[PDB]
Amino acid sequence: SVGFGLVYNSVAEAKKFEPTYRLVRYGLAEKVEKASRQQRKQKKNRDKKIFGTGKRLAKKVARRNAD
Amino acid sequence: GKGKPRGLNSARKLRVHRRNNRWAENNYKKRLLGTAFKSSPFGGSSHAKGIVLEKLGIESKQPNSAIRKCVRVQLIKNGKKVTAFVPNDGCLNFVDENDEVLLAGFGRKGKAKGDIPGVRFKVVKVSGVSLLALWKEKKEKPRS
Amino acid sequence: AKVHGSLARAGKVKSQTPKVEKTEKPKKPKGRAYKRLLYTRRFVNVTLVNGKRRMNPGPS
Amino acid sequence: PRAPRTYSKTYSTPKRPYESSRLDAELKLAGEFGLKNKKEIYRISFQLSKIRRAARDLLTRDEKDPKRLFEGNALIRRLVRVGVLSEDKKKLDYVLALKVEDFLERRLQTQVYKLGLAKSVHHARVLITQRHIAVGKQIVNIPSFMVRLDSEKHIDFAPTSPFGGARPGRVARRNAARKAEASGE
RNA sequence: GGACUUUUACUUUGAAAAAAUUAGAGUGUUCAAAGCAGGCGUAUUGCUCGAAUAUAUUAGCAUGGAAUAAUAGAAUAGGACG
RNA sequence: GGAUAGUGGCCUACCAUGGUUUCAACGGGUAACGGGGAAUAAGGGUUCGAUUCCGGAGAGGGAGCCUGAGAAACGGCUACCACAUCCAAGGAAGGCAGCAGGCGCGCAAAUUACCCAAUCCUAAUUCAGGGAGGUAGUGACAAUAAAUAACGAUACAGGGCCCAUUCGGGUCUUGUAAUUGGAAUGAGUACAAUGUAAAUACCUUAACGAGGAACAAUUGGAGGGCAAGUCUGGUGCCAGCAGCCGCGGUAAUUCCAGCUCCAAUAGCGUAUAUUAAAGUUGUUGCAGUUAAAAAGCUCGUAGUUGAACUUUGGGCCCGGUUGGCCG
Numbered sequence: 001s002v003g004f005g006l007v008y009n010s011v012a013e014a015k016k017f018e019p020t021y022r023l024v025r026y027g028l029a030e031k032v033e034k035a036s037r038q039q040r041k042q043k044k045n046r047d048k049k050i051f052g053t054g055k056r057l058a059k060k061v062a063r064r065n066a067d
Numbered sequence: 068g069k070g071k072p073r074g075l076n077s078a079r080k081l082r083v084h085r086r087n088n089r090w091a092e093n094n095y096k097k098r099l100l101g102t103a104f105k106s107s108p109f110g111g112s113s114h115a116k117g118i119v120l121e122k123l124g125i126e127s128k129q130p131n132s133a134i135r136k137c138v139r140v141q142l143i144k145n146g147k148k149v150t151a152f153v154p155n156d157g158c159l160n161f162v163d164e165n166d167e168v169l170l171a172g173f174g175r176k177g178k179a180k181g182d183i184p185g186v187r188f189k190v191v192k193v194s195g196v197s198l199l200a201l202w203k204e205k206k207e208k209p210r211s
Numbered sequence: 212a213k214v215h216g217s218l219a220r221a222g223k224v225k226s227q228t229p230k231v232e233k234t235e236k237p238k239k240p241k242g243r244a245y246k247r248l249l250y251t252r253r254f255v256n257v258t259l260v261n262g263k264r265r266m267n268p269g270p271s
Numbered sequence: 272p273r274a275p276r277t278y279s280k281t282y283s284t285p286k287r288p289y290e291s292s293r294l295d296a297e298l299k300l301a302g303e304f305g306l307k308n309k310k311e312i313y314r315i316s317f318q319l320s321k322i323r324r325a326a327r328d329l330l331t332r333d334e335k336d337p338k339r340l341f342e343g344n345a346l347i348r349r350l351v352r353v354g355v356l357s358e359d360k361k362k363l364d365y366v367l368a369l370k371v372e373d374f375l376e377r378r379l380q381t382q383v384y385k386l387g388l389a390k391s392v393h394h395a396r397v398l399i400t401q402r403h404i405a406v407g408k409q410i411v412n413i414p415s416f417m418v419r420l421d422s423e424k425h426i427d428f429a430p431t432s433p434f435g436g437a438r439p440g441r442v443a444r445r446n447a448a449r450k451a452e453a454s455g456e
Numbered sequence: 457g458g459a460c461u462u463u464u465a466c467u468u469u470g471a472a473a474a475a476a477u478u479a480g481a482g483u484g485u486u487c488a489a490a491g492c493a494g495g496c497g498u499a500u501u502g503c504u505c506g507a508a509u510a511u512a513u514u515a516g517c518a519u520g521g522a523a524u525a526a527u528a529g530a531a532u533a534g535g536a537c538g
Numbered sequence: 539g540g541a542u543a544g545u546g547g548c549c550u551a552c553c554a555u556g557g558u559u560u561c562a563a564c565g566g567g568u569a570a571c572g573g574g575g576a577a578u579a580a581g582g583g584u585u586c587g588a589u590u591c592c593g594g595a596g597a598g599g600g601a602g603c604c605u606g607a608g609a610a611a612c613g614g615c616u617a618c619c620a621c622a623u624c625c626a627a628g629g630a631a632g633g634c635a636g637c638a639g640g641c642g643c644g645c646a647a648a649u650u651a652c653c654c655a656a657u658c659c660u661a662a663u664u665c666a667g668g669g670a671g672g673u674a675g676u677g678a679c680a681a682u683a684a685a686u687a688a689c690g691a692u693a694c695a696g697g698g699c700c701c702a703u704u705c706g707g708g709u710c711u712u713g714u715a716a717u718u719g720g721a722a723u724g725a726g727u728a729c730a731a732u733g734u735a736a737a738u739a740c741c742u743u744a745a746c747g748a749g750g751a752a753c754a755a756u757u758g759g760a761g762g763g764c765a766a767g768u769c770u771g772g773u774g775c776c777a778g779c780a781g782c783c784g785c786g787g788u789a790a791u792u793c794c795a796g797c798u799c800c801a802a803u804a805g806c807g808u809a810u811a812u813u814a815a816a817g818u819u820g821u822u823g824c825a826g827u828u829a830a831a832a833a834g835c836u837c838g839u840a841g842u843u844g845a846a847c848u849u850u851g852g853g854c855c856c857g858g859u860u861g862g863c864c865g
């Protein structure tokens with residue numbers, strides 16, 4: 001079997017120059033899993049239809065629930 | 068020297084003159100006049116898929132004696148009407164009027180094939196199946 | 212020439228030829244092995260030289 | 272947008288399709304060297320076809336031409352290095368002659384057979400594809416490997432399989448499991 | 457630097473020149489189509505060859521050739537030299 | 539002069555009558571984007587290039603324009619034309635020749651999936667974004683390697699060969715065998731680790747996994763060209779075959795089957811196109827008395843073509859690159 005390998009001049013040296021998937025493979029880093037990549041895209045697009053904070057927009061629709 | 072100008076500067080005459088006589092070539096003419104696209108039932112396409120109008124027994128040419136069992140087809144991209152032979156004993160019972168057949172050429176470069184007069188094509192599929200499969204057993208004609 | 216002659220007999224002969232099922236037979240080897248079977252049959256042991264050679268002979 | 276992954280094919284096909292002489296001649300090559308195809312003959316005569324071509328082309332240039340020297344000697348040394356071209360005939364009017372069997376005689380299909388080890392070129396096939404018979408410790412399962420004449424000393428069975436020891440294999444190790452059960456405990 | 461020079465065709469060599477394709481060298485991708493790799497030890501602390509070459513014309517440019525084939529020159533001398 | 543970033547009939551004013559063309563202008567066609575290139579292998583050619591690189595053009599059709607270094611931009615706006623969605627009828631919105639996916643068209647073409655790990659690109663920027671791109675799926679477009687078996691034993695039959703007065707079988711195996719014999723292997727299945735961004739496959743490899751009921755090769759053909767039956771049964775100028783020549787009207791070497799056989803073989807057939815065969819487009823290289831083809835005749839412009847002759851011969855020098863005989 002022919003591979004390739006690295007050895008780092010410290011442990012904290014490896015953790016900063018190494019890919020963040022490699023440390024995951026090993027157990028030296030967690031995999032913080034997020035929304036599906038096309039799920040985030042849609043969340044950005046929904047975030048584009050608002051101008052400003054968006055909690056200020058909630059109150060004007062709480063007036064809609066009367067009229 | 069009989070004809071063709073041999074001089075070193077006669078190229079123009081030489082290509083002009085050859086450009087002329089290429090029109091006596093049947094294929095060069097056909098390809099440049101676009102006879103494929105202009106005339107002919109297929110568009111120049113490999114095959115074409117029409118719809119069966121009637122069923123014809125065709126009386127074979129001499130010195131044969133037979134009834135050749137073809138189908139009148141109206142090409143779907145055209146409306147051009149075309150008569151087409153149904154090969155392989157039976158297979159006329161495989162078609163029906165208004166059935167949807169896919170026709171190919173006869174491999175004569177236009178040019179009707181056998182004792183069959185006028186027929187430049189042949190059926191390949193009916194109802195999207197292929198007569199071959201139906202003729203042997205490998206497939207069944209679809210429902211409707 | 213007549214274009215409307217009878218269709219009644221379409222499929223005639225094939226319908227009325229007496230059925231014969233296939234007969235179960237030795238399996239033939241595939242690929243290289245079949246070529247060997249052809250080599251030894253054609254050349255190695257030969258068979259018959261009668262007048263020259265035959266391939267699909269009947270009664271002779 | 273990529274680089275085209277390139278290719279080319281390895282065989283040419285005979286002009287006249289039915290020739291009793293050529294079909295007789297061809298089958299006899301498959302019979303001798305253990306081929307499954309007429310394509311395996313087609314493939315080789317196509318290789319030969321271009322080698323003769325390159326040699327035909329060089330032979331027309333002047334002797335001691337820079338190109339004729341560089342590419343002529345290189346073609347030669349490669350045909351020696353595999354063992355098709357004889358060491359005496361090394362000057363390439365033989366590469367212009369040659370013939371198909373000289374290439375066929377160099378196949379790992381045949382060289383596994385040539386010194387013992389096979390006995391019937393067909394048995395040579397079955398062994399090759401079945402991961403017996405290495406060259407180095409490297410197993411090679413292609414019958415067409417073309418023994419390179421200095422790897423010829425090294426064709427033995429593999430560090431694996433029977434015949435090279437370090438296991439019988441499952442058919443035998445199934446029968447060893449019916450002796451210590453029926454006749455044993 | 458000053459002062460002037462009949463026009464060409466052909467042919468030679470060369471420059472300017474994309475890569476992939478093609479032709480083709482080297483390399484054993486297990487073979488091969490390919491790829492541009494790879495090959496060596498002290499395999500515990502590196503050593504090392506590569507990643508060529510060819511075509512690339514018609515036109516333009518640069519150089520050599522003076523056969524072949526054109527072209528111009530002096531006859532009311534308004535000639536050539538100084 | 540105006541306009542341009544700037545040259546220019548770019549535009550305007552004034553002035554002139556010019557510019558192109560049988561060496562084919564202008565016009566028409568193009569089922570025309572151009573190029574690197576592709577197919578065909580004596581050479582010369584013929585044919586093709588929408589399409590992985592370069593250039594150009596476009597974003598339903600036209601025109602216009604804001605922003606900006608850069609756009610006459612369309613995943614920017616404005617208008618008109620054509621489409622077309624929502625509605626409370628007041629109005630409002632849209633531009634897949636991006637990635638998928640649907641309709642339609644047809645002979646004709648795949649997933650509404652995963653990822654920024656690589657390749658590179660952009661930003662204020664090592665971080666974020668990237669349907670660029672990579673990953674997998676669909677996938678006989680094409681291209682590569684090449685399993686469907688291999689080895690003994692035996693029962694006779696040989697063919698050898700020593701001997702033959704004559705049984706004959708005996709050792710050297712030729713192989714056709716209706717009982718046999720133990721071997722081998724991945725096709726699959728699958729611990730595991732490898733692989734990968736995470737998966738999937740491949741390469742590795744535990745446990746498994748071949749005897750005819752498989753784990754069972756096809757596709758065409760068998761009168762000629764053209765490789766392989768004059769077998770048997772069917773039909774009886776019908777049904778069908780047949781690229782071409784031709785087969786079928788009762789013993790069909792061409793049909794419909796069975797048997798057997800041939801060629802190519804994980805592929806093989808048909809249709810269409812094109813190339814070679816084609817020296818049937820002929821520069822290389824055709825033909826024209828009678829087979830297709832010399833204009834009834836001469837003149838003649840363009841075009842092609844066009845006799846011979848002008849430093850030839852002699853002498854010396856210089857230094858190269860092969861090859862000989864010696865080294």
Ligand SMILES: [Mg+2]
Pocket residue numbers: 091
């Ligand atoms: Mg005419």
Ligand SMILES: [Mg+2]
Pocket residue numbers: none
């Ligand atoms: Mg006739």
Ligand SMILES: [Mg+2]
Pocket residue numbers: 139
């Ligand atoms: Mg009618």
Ligand SMILES: [Mg+2]
Pocket residue numbers: none
């Ligand atoms: Mg239409």
Ligand SMILES: [Mg+2]
Pocket residue numbers: none
């Ligand atoms: Mg002016």
Ligand SMILES: [Mg+2]
Pocket residue numbers: 570
């Ligand atoms: Mg167009």
Ligand SMILES: [Mg+2]
Pocket residue numbers: 570
């Ligand atoms: Mg084109």
Ligand SMILES: [Mg+2]
Pocket residue numbers: 587
């Ligand atoms: Mg193009």
Ligand SMILES: [Mg+2]
Pocket residue numbers: none
């Ligand atoms: Mg073109």
Ligand SMILES: [Mg+2]
Pocket residue numbers: 588
């Ligand atoms: Mg188009």
Ligand SMILES: [Mg+2]
Pocket residue numbers: 598
């Ligand atoms: Mg559209």
Ligand SMILES: [Mg+2]
Pocket residue numbers: none
């Ligand atoms: Mg318009």
Ligand SMILES: [Mg+2]
Pocket residue numbers: 611612
């Ligand atoms: Mg626009």
Ligand SMILES: [Mg+2]
Pocket residue numbers: 613634
């Ligand atoms: Mg868009």
Ligand SMILES: [Mg+2]
Pocket residue numbers: none
């Ligand atoms: Mg855009």
Ligand SMILES: [Mg+2]
Pocket residue numbers: 626628
């Ligand atoms: Mg309202």
